[PDB]
Design a protein around this ligand. Structure first.
Ligand SMILES: Nc1nc2c(ncn2[C@@H]2O[C@H](COP(=O)(O)OP(=O)(O)OP(=O)(O)O)[C@@H](O)[C@H]2O)c(=O)[nH]1
Ligand SMILES: Nc1nc2c(ncn2[C@@H]2O[C@H](COP(=O)(O)OP(=O)(O)O)[C@@H](O)[C@H]2O)c(=O)[nH]1
Ligand SMILES: Nc1nc2c(ncn2[C@@H]2O[C@H](COP(=O)(O)OP(=O)(O)O)[C@@H](O)[C@H]2O)c(=O)[nH]1
Ligand SMILES: [Mg+2]
Lengths: 27, 97, 430, 110, 439, 430
C-alpha cells in the first residue's frame, strides 16, 4: 500500500514553479 | 529553453533601446554575480575574456538581431547538459526577475 | 525647535506607525528614498519637527521601532517606505512575550529595554529643543501593553517636564481577538493613568462601523483603518507644523483640555468623510463640517456621547475660512445641546484655525473630546476582568513570573476609583 | 574531485591571467628606441599637492550659503580682492588649458 | 623633497606592507604596472608622490620599500602576483630556510648572512634620497625571523645613521587568543631590544581589530586582509600631512617633540574613526563631534587595553577632509569638560591637532564606505603597562621550569638574556608606575 | 628549497610508501608514467620538494626502497605506479631477517647498509637546501625495526643539524601478529629516543576500529588503512608545499611541540572522516571540524587521550577559512576542557593555515598531539617484555648473533625511565 500510495505519487513536476506569498484641469 | 533565451533578449532590448550592438551587450553583461564567480571558481577577468573570445571576431560596432542572438546561445545550451546550470546563467547574467 | 520623537511597539503599533510615516512623508513631499522633492516652500518650512538631516542631504525620521518579535519588523522593513528608517533604530528581542503582560514587563522587557532607552536618550539629547513624546501601541497585546507602559514610566522618570502622548487601541467587546485580553488591558490602564499626560483611545469596531456606514466600503482592511488613524493623528500636529490664524500646540491642548490631573482620556474623530458616490453631492462648509464633527457616528470610539456630558472639547480646523463663522457655529452648537454640556464651566469649546488644509481637500477638521461617556469602556473591561478573576482562570501564567494577586487587586481598585471619580463630575452640579 | 586553487592573495587583489601570443610581440615594439636612465627634476617644481586656490583656508563655493565663503565673508566694509581674483584666475587657467589642451583630470593640476 | 623609508620584515610586516602599498598606489593614481595613466602633466609643479615613490624618468615609479624574509613563500608569491612589475627586483630580499619561531636563530645564526645585504640595500636606497625624514618599520614580535631581524636591523641602523628618527608599528600578542605557544619568550626579548632603539612604538594586536570589525562593519568572517586594510588606512592618515596641504601641517618631527615626555616612555596605542559599512553611511550624521567621541570611546581602540585604568599623557589627532578649527576646538573643549577622561596633573594642555584637505581614499571591493571626514589618533597613556604585566606573567609562569630553553640555548644564546630581559621589563613597569603618580 | 627525502623499509613501510606516493602523485597531477597533466600553476612551483628531476619530461620521486628480501619490492614494482621509482634506488638482500632484531641490526644489516647509505648520501648531496628526513616502517618486525633504526643512527651521526620525522607502526597486543614483538619493540624504542626528533606512532587496532566505526565498511583490507595513513602523512607538509596565511614547517612544529628533549612522542589524527551514506548530509564548517578533531576515537593510536593531559598540540588547517573562527574555536576548546590541558603552560595549541585543500574536499585539518596518555602503550609493552624475559624465552635466537643480556636490561631500564619521566608531569603543578 505504501509503495503504490506514497512512494510513487509525486513526480518531477509539481516542484518546477513553486511560488508562495512574499513578505482636474477644469479652468 | 527558447522562451527563456527570448525573454533574456527583451530585457536587454529595453535597456539598450531600439538597437543592440556587441559593445552594448558587453557593457550590459553582469560580470559581478555570474553562476561561478560567487563560488570563487574563477575571477571576473576570466569570464569577460572568455565571453568576448567566444563571441567571435565580429567588430564591436556591428549590430546583431534576434535571430543572431538566439543562434549564439543555441550553442551554449547545446554544450551545457545541466538544465539547472543553463537556467542560472541566463537569469543572473541579464538580471532576469 | 519644539520637535517631537516617535516610538512604537507591538504589531498594531508598528502598523499604525508605518502608515503614519507614509502619510507624513506624502504630505511633506519626501520620497521613499529619503530625498526631498516638494513643490511648496511651506513643505520644507518646518521639516525639523519629525525628521533628521544626515550627510548627503537625505532625511530620516526620528522614529524608534521596538518589539520582541522580528516578524513584523522584517515585514515593515521590506514594505513600502521601509528605507526611511535608520537601520540602527531597529531593536528587537528574539523570544517574544506570547500575549503575556508579565512576560513583556518583567522577564524580557526589563533586560531588553536598556538598549532602546539608550537610543531614546540619544535622540532626545540630539534634538535641539524637545517638545514631547508620542507613542503608538495597543492595550490587548502582551508585549506592547507591557513594554510600552514600562518605557513610559522610565521616560517620565527621566524627563519630567515634557509632554507624553499615547495613541492606544483599547479592547472592544464585540470584536475580540484575545482571551486573556481584559487582564493585560486593566494592568496597562493602571500604569498608564499614573504617568501618561494624554491618552487617546481607538476601537476596531468603531473603525469598522465608520468605514462601512460613512464610507460605504465593501471590503475594508487594516490598511484603511491605519489610514484613518494616521490622518487623525497628523491632524493634531498640523497646526504645529504649519502657520495659522490661531496657532496651538500640544501644551496648549493639554492645558485647555485637562481640568483635573487624572481625567486625561480623550476620544478623537476626523472630518470630512464621504463615500465615492456622494463625493460630488456634498458642499464643504463650516456648518456641515461641524455637524459631521459632532455626529456621534463619526467618533473613533464605541462610547456614545448621549450617554454622558462633555467636559471640554477641541476642534482644529484646517484650511482658509473665516473666524466669525467658526465662533458662531461653536456658540450655536453649545447653546443647542446645552443639556449635553457640563454647566459649571462656560464656553467649554476651543477652536483653532490653521491656514494649510490637507493635500487634496480645501478644508478638514480634527476633533478631540473629553466626555463623561468614556467610563462605559472601563466598566465593560472591569466586568470581564472580575468575571474571569473570580475563578482565577489563566492566572498561573502571571503568577509564575514574579507577580501575585495583590497587584491584580490593586489594579482593579485603581480602575474602579478612576471610574467612580470620573462619573462623579458627570452629575456634579453648580 | 576538484582542485579549487584560488589562494587568499589572488581572491583579495587579483590574478592577471593574460599574455596572449600577439600581446608580447606588440609590447616589444614599444622599446625599439626606449633608453634606460633619467635626467634630474629641474627643481622649483618639487612641492606638495595644492588643493585650495586661497591661503590659510579651503576655497569652497556651493549653492548652500553656509559654505560659500563669499556669502560668509560679506561682513567686510568692502568687497575683498581675493575671491574675485581667484575666480578670474580659475577662468583664465581654464581658457589657457583649452588653448593648449590638457584635460588633466581636474583644473588644479595646471 | 620629503620622503620616508619603509622596512617590511617578517610575514606580518610583509602582509601589512602589501596592503599599504596597494593603498598608496591607488591614492596617488599609480597603476599596478607602476605607470601613471598620463593626464597628469602641464609642467606638474608638485611631486606629491615623492614621499613614497621615486620616478625612473619615463613613465613608471618605484616604491621606497624593502622586503625581508627568510622563507621564500610570500616573497615569491608577491614576485609572481599582480604587482610583479612595480617593485624593484633586487629589493625583495629572500632567504633559504625559515627561522621557525626561534629568536636565537633569527638573531645569531642565519640573520647575520642577510643583514649585511639588507644594510647595503638600505644604504643604496638612501643615497639617492635627499630629504630623508625617518624610517617606518613593520614587524611581528611573536615570531622568530620577525623579532630577530627587527632587533638586528634596529641595532645596526641606530649606529649606521643615529639621529634619524624611526617609527615602529609592531604587533604584540593578544591577551588570550594567540597562535604560537613559545611566543612570550621572543616577544620579551624583542621588547628588550626595541625599548632602547625605537623612537615611537605603536601596539597593533589582533583581538581588538577583530572586535572593531565585528562591531562596526557587521562582518562575521574576517581575515588578515581586513586588518591590513585598517592598518593601511591608519598609516595613510598619519602620513597625509607630508604630501598634502592643510590648515595645520604636522611633520614627522612633531612626534618626538610632542608625544614623548621622557626618553623611556614612548609606547602608545592608536584609534580610528569613522568605521562604517556601505549601507549605514547614508543614515548617519558623521559630524566632527561624533567622530571625535567615537575615537575616545574605549572599545574603539586598536589595541586590547582599557584606557579607563590609567591616565592620559599626550594625544595627537590628525583630521583630514573638510574639518574646521572651530568645531575641532569645540569638541576638544567638550572632551576636557567630560569627567570620564582623566589626564595627568603635570600636563595641563594635552592635544595637538593636524588638519588636511585630502578626503580619505577608498579601495574598490573593500569594507569601508566613502566618507568625507576622518580622524586618526595616537595617544600616550599610562594604562599600557597592563599588557607588559600579563606578558611577564605568561613568560615567568613557564620559565619557572625552563620550558623550551634547550631550543634557544642550542643555537648559541646565553641563558642570562632571559634574566636581563625580565629585569629591564620590571624596570620599565616601575618607571611607568612612578610616572603615573600625582604631585 | 627546503626539500625532504623519503626512506621506507620493511613490508609495512613499503606499503605505506607506495600508498603515500600514489596520493601525492594524484594530488600534484602526475601520471604513472611521470608526466605532468595538471590544470593550475600552483601544482608546479613546489614540485621539487617531493620529486627530483629527470631528462625526457618526467619527474622521479626521491625515495629509497630497502629490505632484506625482494618479495615486497617485486610486489610494489609489479603494482600500479611502480614505474616512478628509479631502478637504482632498490636495495635488497637475499636472506631476510626472520623477525630477529639481532639479525636485522648486527650481522646482515651492517654488511648491507653501505649501499643504502651511499644512495642516501647521493640524494642528500644532490638536493641543494636539505630540510630533513621522514621514515616509515614498523617496530614489531625484524628488518624494519632493526636496520631502519640502524640507518637512523647512522644518518643522525652524519647530519646532526637536519630534522628527522618518523612514522612508526608500533604493535598493539589486542591484535598480535608475532610472538616475539615485545623484544624488538623495546630494543627499537630504546634506540629511537636518542636520535629521532619526531615520532608519530600508529596502531592497526586503532585503524580497524576507526574504519569500522566511522567509515562503516564490513571488509576492510590493508589498502584503506594505508590510505588513511597516507592522508595523515600528506597533511603534515601542506604549508611547506602551498601558500597560506600562516606557514609552518617541520622545525616550527618541533620547536613549538617539544618542551623537553625526551618528550618527542606524538599521536596523530585526521579530519573530516565520514561514511559514504552520510556524505552529503554533513556540513563542512570549522566548528564541526574542530569538534571531530579532538574526539578520542578519531585518534590513530589505541591510547585513550582522556586518561591523561595534553602538553602541547598543533593544528594544520587547509582550505579557505577565517582566522577569527579558527582562533576562537581553539580558545573555546582550550577553555571548555581545561581539565585535560596541563595548567603551567598557557595557549598550548598552535594553529596553522594552508590555502589549498585536498582534491575533492573543501576544508581539512590534521591534528598532532603530545599527550601524557601515550605512556600506557610503553607500560604494556614493558610489562610483556618483563613477563617473557623473566623466563628467558626465545632469548637464544637473539644471543646467538653477538647480542648480550646487558643491552636487553639497559633497553628495559631506559624504557621504564622514559615512562617515569614522561608521566611525572601529569600531576606536576608549578
Ligand atoms: N594582524 C595580522 N597579524 C599577522 C599577519 N601575519 C602574521 N601575523 C602575526 O604574526 C604572528 C606569527 O609570526 P609570523 O608572521 O606568522 O612568522 P614570522 O614573524 O615571519 O616569524 P617566523 O615564523 O620565524 O617566520 C602571528 O601570531 C600573527 O598574529 C597579518 O597579516 N595580520
Ligand atoms: N487598527 C489596527 N489594529 C490592529 C492591527 N493589527 C492588530 N491589531 C489589533 O491588535 C490586537 C492584538 O494586539 P497584538 O498584535 O497582540 O499586540 P502585540 O502583542 O503588542 O503585538 C487585535 O485585537 C487587533 O484588533 C492593525 O494593523 N491595525
Ligand atoms: N598498515 C599496514 N600495516 C601492515 C602492512 N603490512 C604489514 N603490516 C603490519 O606489520 C606487522 C608485521 O611487520 P613486518 O612486516 O613483519 O616487519 P618486518 O619483518 O621488519 O618487515 C604486522 O603486525 C602488520 O600489522 C600494511 O600493508 N599496512
Ligand atoms: Mg616567516
Amino acid at each position: 500500500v505504501y509503495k503504490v500510495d506514497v512512494s510513487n505519487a509525486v513526480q518531477p513536476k509539481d516542484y518546477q514553479n513553486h511560488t508562495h506569498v512574499k513578505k482636474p484641469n477644469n479652468e | 529553453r527558447r522562451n527563456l533565451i527570448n525573454l533574456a533578449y527583451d530585457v536587454l532590448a529595453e535597456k539598450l533601446g531600439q538597437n543592440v550592438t556587441l559593445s552594448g551587450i558587453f557593457s550590459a553583461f553582469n560580470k559581478i554575480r555570474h553562476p561561478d564567480v560567487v563560488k570563487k571558481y574563477g575571477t571576473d577577468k576570466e569570464i569577460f575574456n572568455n565571453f568576448v573570445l567566444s563571441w567571435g571576431n565580429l567588430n564591436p560596432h556591428i549590430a546583431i538581431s534576434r535571430e543572431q542572438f538566439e543562434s549564439y546561445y543555441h550553442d551554449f545550451s547545446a554544450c551545457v547538459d545541466k538544465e539547472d546550470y543553463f537556467e542560472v546563467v541566463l537569469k543572473n547574467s541579464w538580471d532576469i526577475p | 525647535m519644539r520637535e517631537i520623537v516617535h516610538i512604537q511597539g507591538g504589531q498594531c503599533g508598528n502598523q499604525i506607525g508605518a502608515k503614519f510615516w507614509e502619510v507624513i512623508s506624502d504630505e511633506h513631499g519626501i520620497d521613499p528614498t529619503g530625498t526631498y522633492h516638494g513643490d511648496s516652500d511651506l513643505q520644507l518650512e518646518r521639516i525639523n519637527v519629525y525628521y533628521n538631516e544626515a550627510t548627503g542631504g537625505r532625511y530620516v525620521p526620528r522614529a524608534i521601532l521596538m518589539d520582541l518579535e522580528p516578524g513584523t519588523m522584517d515585514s515593515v522593513r521590506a514594505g513600502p517606505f521601509g528605507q526611511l528608517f535608520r537601520p540602527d533604530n531597529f531593536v528587537f528581542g528574539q523570544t517574544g512575550a506570547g500575549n503575556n503582560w508579565a512576560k513583556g514587563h518583567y522577564t524580557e522587557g526589563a533586560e531588553l529595554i536598556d538598549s532602546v532607552l539608550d537610543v531614546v536618550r540619544k535622540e532626545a539629547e540630539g534634538c535641539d529643543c524637545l517638545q514631547g513624546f508620542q507613542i503608538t501601541h495597543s492595550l490587548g497585546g502582551g508585549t506592547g501593553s507591557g513594554m510600552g507602559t514600562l518605557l513610559i514610566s522610565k521616560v517620565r522618570e527621566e524627563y519630567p517636564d515634557r509632554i507624553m502622548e499615547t495613541f492606544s487601541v483599547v479592547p472592544s467587546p464585540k470584536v475580540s481577538d484575545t482571551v486573556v485580553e481584559p487582564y493585560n488591558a486593566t494592568l496597562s490602564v493602571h500604569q498608564l493613568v499614573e504617568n501618561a499626560d494624554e491618552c487617546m483611545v481607538i476601537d476596531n469596531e468603531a473603525l469598522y462601523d465608520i468605514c462601512f456606514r460613512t464610507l460605504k466600503l465593501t471590503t475594508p482592511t487594516y490598511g484603511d483603518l491605519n489610514h484613518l488613524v494616521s490622518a487623525a493623528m497628523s491632524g493634531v500636529t498640523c497646526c504645529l507644523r504649519f502657520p495659522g490664524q490661531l496657532n496651538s500646540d500640544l501644551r496648549k491642548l493639554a492645558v485647555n483640555l485637562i481640568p483635573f490631573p487624572r481625567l486625561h482620556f480623550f476620544m478623537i474623530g476626523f472630518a470630512p468623510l464621504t463615500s465615492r458616490g456622494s463625493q460630488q453631492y456634498r458642499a464643504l462648509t463650516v456648518p456641515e463640517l461641524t455637524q459631521q464633527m459632532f455626529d456621534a457616528k463619526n467618533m473613533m470610539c464605541a462610547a456614545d456621547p448621549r450617554h454622558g456630558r462633555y467636559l471640554t472639547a477641541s476642534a482644529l480646523f484646517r484650511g482658509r475660512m473665516s473666524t466669525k463663522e467658526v465662533d458662531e457655529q461653536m456658540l450655536n452648537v453649545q447653546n443647542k445641546n446645552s443639556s449635553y454640556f457640563v454647566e459649571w464651566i462656560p464656553n467649554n469649546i476651543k477652536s483653532s484655525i490653521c491656514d494649510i488644509p490637507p493635500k487634496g481637500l480645501k478644508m478638514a477638521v480634527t476633533f478631540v473630546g473629553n466626555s463623561t461617556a468614556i467610563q462605559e469602556m472601563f466598566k465593560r473591561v472591569a466586568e470581564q476582568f472580575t468575571a474571569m478573576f473570580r475563578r482565577k482562570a489563566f492566572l498561573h501564567w502571571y503568577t509564575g513570573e514574579g507577580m501575585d494577586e495583590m497587584e491584580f487587586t490593586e489594579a482593579e481598585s485603581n480602575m474602579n476609583d478612576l471610574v467612580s471619580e470620573y462619573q462623579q463630575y458627570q452629575d456634579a452640579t453648580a | 574531485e576538484k582542485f579549487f586553487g584560488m589562494t587568499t592573495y589572488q581572491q583579495s587583489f587579483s590574478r592577471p591571467l593574460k599574455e596572449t601570443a600577439h600581446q608580447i610581440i606588440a609590447q616589444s615594439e614599444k622599446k625599439i628606441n626606449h633608453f634606460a636612465g633619467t635626467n634630474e627634476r629641474p627643481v622649483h617644481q618639487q612641492s606638495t599637492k595644492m588643493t585650495s586656490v586661497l591661503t590659510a583656508e579651503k576655497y569652497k563655493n556651493e549653492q548652500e550659503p553656509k559654505d560659500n565663503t563669499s556669502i560668509q565673508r560679506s561682513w567686510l566694509p568692502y568687497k575683498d580682492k581675493a575671491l574675485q581674483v581667484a575666480e578670474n584666475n580659475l577662468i583664465k587657467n581654464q581658457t589657457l588649458n583649452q588653448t593648449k589642451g590638457f584635460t588633466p583630470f581636474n583644473p588644479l593640476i595646471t | 623633497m620629503r620622503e620616508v623609508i619603509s622596512i617590511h620584515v617578517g610575514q606580518g610586516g610583509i602582509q601589512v606592507g602589501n596592503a599599504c602599498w596597494e593603498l598608496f598606489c591607488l591614492e596617488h593614481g599609480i597603476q599596478p604596472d607602476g605607470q601613471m595613466p598620463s593626464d597628469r602633466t602641464i609642467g606638474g609643479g608638485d611631486d606629491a608622490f615623492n614621499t613614497f615613490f621615486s620616478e625612473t624618468g619615463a613613465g613608471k615609479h618605484v616604491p621606497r620599500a624593502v622586503f625581508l624574509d627568510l622563507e621564500p613563500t610570500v616573497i615569491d608569491e608577491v614576485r609572481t602576483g599582480t604587482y610583479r612589475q612595480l617593485f624593484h627586483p633586487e629589493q625583495l630580499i629572500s632567504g633559504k630556510e625559515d627561522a621557525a619561531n626561534n629568536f636565537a636563530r633569527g638573531h645569531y645564526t642565519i640573520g647575520k648572512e642577510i643583514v649585511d645585504l639588507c644594510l647595503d640595500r638600505i644604504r643604496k636606497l638612501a643615497d639617492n634620497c635627499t630629504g630623508l625624514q625617518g624610517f617606518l618599520v613593520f614587524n611581528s614580535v611573536g615570531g622568530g625571523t620577525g623579532s630577530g631581524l627587527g632587533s638586528l636591523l634596529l641595532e645596526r641602523l641606530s649606529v649606521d645613521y643615529g639621529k634619524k628618527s624611526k617609527l615602529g608599528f609592531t604587533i604584540y600578542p593578544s591577551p588570550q587568543v594567540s597562535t604560537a605557544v613559545v611566543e612570550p619568550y621572543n616577544s620579551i626579548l624583542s621588547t628588550h631590544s626595541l625599548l632602547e632603539h625605537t623612537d615611537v612604538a605603536v601596539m597593533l594586536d589582533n583581538e581588538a581589530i577583530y572586535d572593531i570589525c565585528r562591531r562596526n562593519l557587521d562582518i562575521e568572517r574576517p581575515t588578515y586582509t581586513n586588518l591590513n586594510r585598517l592598518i593601511a588606512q591608519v598609516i595613510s592618515s598619519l602620513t597625509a600631512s607630508l604630501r598634502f596641504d592643510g590648515a595645520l601641517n604636522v611633520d614627522i618631527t612633531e612626534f618626538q617633540t610632542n608625544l614623548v615626555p621622557y626618553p623611556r616612555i614612548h609606547f602608545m596605542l592608536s584609534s580610528y574613526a569613522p568605521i562604517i559599512s556601505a549601507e549605514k553611511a547614508y543614515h548617519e550624521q558623521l559630524s566632527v563631534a561624533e567622530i571625535t567621541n567615537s575615537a575616545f570611546e574605549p572599545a574603539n581602540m586598536m589595541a586590547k587595553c582599557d584606557p579607563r585604568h590609567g591616565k592620559y599623557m599626550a594625544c595627537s589627532m590628525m583630521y583630514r577632509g573638510d574639518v574646521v578649527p572651530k568645531d575641532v576646538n569645540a569638541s576638544i573643549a567638550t572632551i576636557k569638560t567630560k569627567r570620564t577622561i582623566q589626564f595627568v596633573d603635570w600636563c595641563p594642555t594635552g592635544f595637538k591637532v593636524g588638519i588636511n584637505y585630502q578626503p580619505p581614499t577608498v579601495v574598490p571591493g573593500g569594507d569601508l564606505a566613502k566618507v568625507m571626514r576622518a580622524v586618526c589618533m595616537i595617544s600616550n597613556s599610562t594604562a599600557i603597562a597592563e599588557v607588559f604585566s600579563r606578558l611577564d606573567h605568561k613568560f615567568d609562569l613557564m620559565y619557572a621550569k625552563r620550558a623550551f630553553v634547550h631550543w634557544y640555548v642550542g643555537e648559541g644564546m646565553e641563558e642570562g638574556e632571559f634574566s636581563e630581559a625580565r629585569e629591564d621589563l620590571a624596570a620599565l613597569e616601575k618607571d611607568y608606575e612612578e610616572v603615573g603618580i600625582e604631585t
